[PDB]
mmCIF file of C-alpha atoms in Angstrom:
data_model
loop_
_atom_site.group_PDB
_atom_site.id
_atom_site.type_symbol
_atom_site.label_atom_id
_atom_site.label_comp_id
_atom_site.label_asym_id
_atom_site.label_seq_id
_atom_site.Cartn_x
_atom_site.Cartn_y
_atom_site.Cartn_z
ATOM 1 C CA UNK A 1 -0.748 -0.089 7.304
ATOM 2 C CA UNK A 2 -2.250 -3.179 9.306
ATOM 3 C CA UNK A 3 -4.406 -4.911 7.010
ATOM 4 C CA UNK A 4 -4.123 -7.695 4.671
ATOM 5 C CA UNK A 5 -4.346 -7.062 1.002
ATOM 6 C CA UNK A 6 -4.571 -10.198 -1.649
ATOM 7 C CA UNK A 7 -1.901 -12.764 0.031
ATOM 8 C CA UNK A 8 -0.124 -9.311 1.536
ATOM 9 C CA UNK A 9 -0.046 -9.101 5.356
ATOM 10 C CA UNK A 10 0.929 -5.145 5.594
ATOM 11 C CA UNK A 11 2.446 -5.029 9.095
ATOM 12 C CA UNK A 12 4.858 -7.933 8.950
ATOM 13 C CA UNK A 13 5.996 -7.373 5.650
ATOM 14 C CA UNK A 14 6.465 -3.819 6.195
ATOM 15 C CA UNK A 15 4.110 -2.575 3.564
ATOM 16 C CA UNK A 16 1.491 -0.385 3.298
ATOM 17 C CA UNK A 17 -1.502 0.582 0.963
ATOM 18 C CA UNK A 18 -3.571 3.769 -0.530
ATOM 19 C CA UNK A 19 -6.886 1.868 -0.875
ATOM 20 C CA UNK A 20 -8.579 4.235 -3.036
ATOM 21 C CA UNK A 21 -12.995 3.721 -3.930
ATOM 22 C CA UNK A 22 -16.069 6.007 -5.030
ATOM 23 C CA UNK A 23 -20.005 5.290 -6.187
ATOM 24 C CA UNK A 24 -21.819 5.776 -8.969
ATOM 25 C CA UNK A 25 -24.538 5.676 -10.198
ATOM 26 C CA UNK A 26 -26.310 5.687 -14.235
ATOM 27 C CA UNK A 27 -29.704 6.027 -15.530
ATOM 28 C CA UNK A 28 -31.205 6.496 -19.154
ATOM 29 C CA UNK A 29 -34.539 8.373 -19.689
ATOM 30 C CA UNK A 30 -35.404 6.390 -22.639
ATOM 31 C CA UNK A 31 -39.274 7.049 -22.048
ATOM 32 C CA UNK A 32 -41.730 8.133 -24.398
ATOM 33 C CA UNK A 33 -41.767 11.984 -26.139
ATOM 34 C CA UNK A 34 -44.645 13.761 -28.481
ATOM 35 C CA UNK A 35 -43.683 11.288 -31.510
ATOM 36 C CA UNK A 36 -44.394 7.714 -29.263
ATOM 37 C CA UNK A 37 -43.452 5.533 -26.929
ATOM 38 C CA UNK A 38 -39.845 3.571 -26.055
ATOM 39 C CA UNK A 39 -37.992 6.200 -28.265
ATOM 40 C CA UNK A 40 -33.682 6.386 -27.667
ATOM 41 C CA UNK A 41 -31.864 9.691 -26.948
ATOM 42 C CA UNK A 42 -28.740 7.873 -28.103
ATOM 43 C CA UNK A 43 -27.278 7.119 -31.752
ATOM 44 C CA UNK A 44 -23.615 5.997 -32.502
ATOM 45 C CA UNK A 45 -21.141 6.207 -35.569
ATOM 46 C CA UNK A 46 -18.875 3.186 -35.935
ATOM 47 C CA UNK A 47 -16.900 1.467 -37.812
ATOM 48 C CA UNK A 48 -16.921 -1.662 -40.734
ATOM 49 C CA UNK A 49 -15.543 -4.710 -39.300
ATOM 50 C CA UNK A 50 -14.745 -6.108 -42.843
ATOM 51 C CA UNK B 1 15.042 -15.476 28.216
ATOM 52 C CA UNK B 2 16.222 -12.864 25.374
ATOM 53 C CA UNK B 3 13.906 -11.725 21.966
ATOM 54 C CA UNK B 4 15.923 -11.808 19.281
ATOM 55 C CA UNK B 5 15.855 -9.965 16.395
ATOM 56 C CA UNK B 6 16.880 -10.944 12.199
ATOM 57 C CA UNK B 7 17.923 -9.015 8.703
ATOM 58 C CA UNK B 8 15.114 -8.822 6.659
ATOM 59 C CA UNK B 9 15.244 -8.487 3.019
ATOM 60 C CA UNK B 10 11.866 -5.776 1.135
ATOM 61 C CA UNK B 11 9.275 -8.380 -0.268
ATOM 62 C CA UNK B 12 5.484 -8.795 -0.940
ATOM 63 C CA UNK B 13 5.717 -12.832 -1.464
ATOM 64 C CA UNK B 14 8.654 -14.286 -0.628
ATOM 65 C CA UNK B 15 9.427 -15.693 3.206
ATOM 66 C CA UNK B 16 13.010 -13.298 4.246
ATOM 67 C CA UNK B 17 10.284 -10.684 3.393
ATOM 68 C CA UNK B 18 8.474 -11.540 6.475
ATOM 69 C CA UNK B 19 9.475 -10.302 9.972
ATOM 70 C CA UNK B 20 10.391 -12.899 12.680
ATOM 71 C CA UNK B 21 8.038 -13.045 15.699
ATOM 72 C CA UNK B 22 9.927 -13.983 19.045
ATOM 73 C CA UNK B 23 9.158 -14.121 22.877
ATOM 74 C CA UNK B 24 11.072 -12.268 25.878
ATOM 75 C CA UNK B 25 10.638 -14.710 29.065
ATOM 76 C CA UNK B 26 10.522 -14.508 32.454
ATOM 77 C CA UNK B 27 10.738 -17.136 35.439
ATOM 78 C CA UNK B 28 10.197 -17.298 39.218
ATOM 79 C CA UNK B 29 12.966 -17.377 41.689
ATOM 80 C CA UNK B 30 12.050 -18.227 45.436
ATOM 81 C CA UNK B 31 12.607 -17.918 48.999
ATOM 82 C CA UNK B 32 10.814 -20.451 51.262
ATOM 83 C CA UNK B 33 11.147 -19.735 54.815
ATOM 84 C CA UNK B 34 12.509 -23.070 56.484
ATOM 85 C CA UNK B 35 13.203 -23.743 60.183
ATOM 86 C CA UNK B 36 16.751 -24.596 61.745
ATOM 87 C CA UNK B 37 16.402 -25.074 66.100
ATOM 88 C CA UNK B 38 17.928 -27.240 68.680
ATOM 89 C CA UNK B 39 16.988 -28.383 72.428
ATOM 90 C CA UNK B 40 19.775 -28.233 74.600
ATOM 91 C CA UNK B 41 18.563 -30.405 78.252
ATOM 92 C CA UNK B 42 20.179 -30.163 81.332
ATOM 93 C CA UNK B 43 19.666 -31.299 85.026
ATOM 94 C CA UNK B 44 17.827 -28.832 87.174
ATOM 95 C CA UNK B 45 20.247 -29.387 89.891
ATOM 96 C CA UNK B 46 23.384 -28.940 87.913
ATOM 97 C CA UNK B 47 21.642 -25.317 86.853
ATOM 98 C CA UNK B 48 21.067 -24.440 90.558
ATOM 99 C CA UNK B 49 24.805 -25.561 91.558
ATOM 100 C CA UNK B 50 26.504 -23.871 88.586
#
């Protein structure tokens, strides 16, 4: 309700603002299994481009 | 000296979106203590015969 948001100054021009954030965080435990090393737990279906 | 206040129109970017700043004032107003006197002489004599 005081700040100043992009170009906005909230006080003067009577404005105010839900800011709104989280964190997060991703890993992928692409390591090695029984069969060998480097080996994907991922595979995708997708379509032609043609 | 008086504020004064304006209408203001509801805007993010345009200027009559903005609220006016303005100044109340105040001055000094003063009494300096000045002398007024007078001698008034007169003959001894003329205080003794009176």
């Amino acid at each position: 309700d005081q700040a100043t948001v992009g170009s906005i100054n909230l006080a003067e021009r009577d404005m105010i603002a839900l800011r709104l954030k989280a964190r997060f965080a991703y890993v992928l435990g692409n390591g090695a299994t029984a069969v060998g090393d480097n080996k994907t737990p991922v595979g995708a279906v997708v379509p032609d481009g043609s | 000296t008086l504020p004064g206040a304006s209408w203001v129109s509801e805007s993010a970017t345009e200027p009559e979106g903005v609220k006016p700043t303005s100044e109340a004032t105040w001055a000094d107003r003063t009494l300096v203590a000045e002398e007024v006197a007078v001698i008034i002489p007169v003959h001894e004599n003329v205080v003794d015969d009176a």
